[PDB]
Design a protein around this ligand. Structure first.
Ligand code: HEM
Ligand SMILES: O=C1C[C@H](c2c[nH]c3ccc(F)cc23)C(=O)N1
Length: 376
């Protein structure tokens, strides 16, 4: 099927919708003017003084995703608010019930996710320029000096960078069942080049993001109500659910990019039964419906790994390894990001990433599992 993947931007939503139908200018204004409404303390009230708009005037997917994004950021700004510690352990029935309903139709859970605040949360400034940081901006933000532009867009520019490798994947599987060795070597080497060029994109996080800002401000807003003490037994979605419900916060863990290439190269991240594997399977529930699909479509295919090892073919192993290396490289570099942006900021606070994991030995499990797949 068509797995909602683009030749140019891969898993990212292509040319997203910036404006909702006029019926929803109530929603739109609260989200568009979020930095000032919590700077004041009128956000929770402006949301409480909102009547229940039904969802059935959102027609196409682009719209429903922008509504997800609007209803998403509002729900976070409400619950967390100033984010200086005072929380709302219950969500207003009037924002809850339409957001819980849109989330059920899209098969996503009712909380801001990677798909919303990165993949649907962008536009290009001058629509006849390339997809660089200068010529791009996010649609929605939480506060000022939250460095949410840098964070969300460097995240995106990696997704973009990976799209050139994802489009090669069908060549790999065709080459295997057509028994075309030269085609397959070229394909894996191409996927390799794209994945090692994506490491340079990661370097931009230092340029456009600020450690203390991310950690003390933006981290609090992308945070979830699942194993969070602040909201002991989840959040109450008044009207929709009889009890309160626990849902994990936003994470690049909800990125299909890194999981896609783990599955392709037969790196069994989602096997073994432990904490790291479990997190990575669970975060697929937070991926869009058609991406969740794409990943198990890749699991359904014959193993590139089993195929490559079946032959005494140095060049093919070298190419397969070059891919696995690229993935280690990125996860090795990503460990340095986390040290700079979470570990040290936390140590100057008189860990806990947005996802909710024992992150340092979680990442190194996931990093270790990757380099265990190196053939040689
Ligand atoms: C300031 C920047 C970043 C920080 C502070 C950060 C932090 C973290 C943390 C704490 C986790 C563990 C999951 C959790 O508990 O949330 C994680 C996982 C992950 N991050 Fe990041 N991250 C950053 C940038 C990026 C970017 C730009 C990407 C990709 C575009 C990325 C990709 C991932 C992936 C795929 C995982 C899941 C684990 C894995 O597959 O290796 N990260 N990150
Ligand atoms: O603390 C973090 C940051 C990191 C992350 C990287 N890109 C993201 C996009 C959205 C989001 F909610 C979180 C992230 C993560 O998985 N936990």
């Amino acid at each position: 099927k068509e797995y909602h993947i683009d030749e140019e931007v891969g898993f990212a939503l292509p040319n997203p919708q910036e404006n909702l139908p006029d019926f929803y200018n109530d929603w739109m204004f609260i989200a568009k003017h979020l930095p000032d409404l919590i700077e004041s303390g009128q956000l929770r009230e402006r949301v409480e003084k909102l009547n229940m708009l039904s969802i059935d005037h959102l027609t196409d997917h682009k719209s429903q995703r922008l509504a997800r994004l609007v209803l998403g950021c509002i729900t976070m700004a409400y619950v967390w608010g100033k984010g200086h510690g005072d929380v709302r352990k219950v969500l207003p029935r009037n924002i809850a019930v339409p957001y819980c309903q849109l989330s059920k139709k899209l098969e996503l859970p009712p909380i801001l996710v990677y798909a919303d605040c990165v993949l649907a949360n962008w536009k290009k400034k001058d629509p006849n320029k390339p997809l660089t940081y200068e010529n791009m901006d996010v649609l929605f933000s939480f506060r000022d000096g939250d460095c949410s532009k840098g964070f969300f867009l460097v995240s995106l520019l990696v997704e973009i960078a990976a799209a050139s490798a994802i489009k090669v994947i069908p060549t790999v599987f065709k080459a295997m069942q057509m028994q075309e060795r030269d085609t397959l070597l070229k394909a894996l080497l191409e996927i390799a080049s794209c994945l090692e060029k994506a490491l340079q994109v990661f370097h931009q996080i230092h340029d456009h993001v600020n450690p203390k800002a991310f950690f003390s401000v933006l981290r609090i807003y992308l945070s979830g109500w699942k194993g969070n003490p602040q909201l002991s037994d989840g959040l109450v979605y008044e009207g929709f659910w009889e009890d309160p419900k626990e849902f994990a916060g936003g994470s690049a863990g909800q990125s299909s990019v890194f999981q896609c290439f783990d599955v392709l190269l037969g790196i069994q991240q989602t096997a073994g039964g432990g904490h790291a594997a479990q997190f990575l399977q669970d975060m697929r529930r937070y991926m869009p419906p058609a991406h969740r699909n794409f990943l198990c479509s890749l699991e359904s295919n014959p193993s590139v790994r089993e195929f490559v090892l079946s032959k005494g073919d140095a060049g093919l192993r070298e190419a397969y390894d070059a891919c696995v290396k690229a993935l280690v490289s990125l996860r090795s570099y990503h460990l340095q990001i986390v040290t700079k942006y979470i570990l040290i900021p936390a140590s100057q606070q008189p860990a806990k990433g947005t996802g909710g994991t024992d992150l340092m030995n979680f990442l190194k499990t996931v990093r270790s599992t990757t380099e265990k797949s190196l053939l040689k």
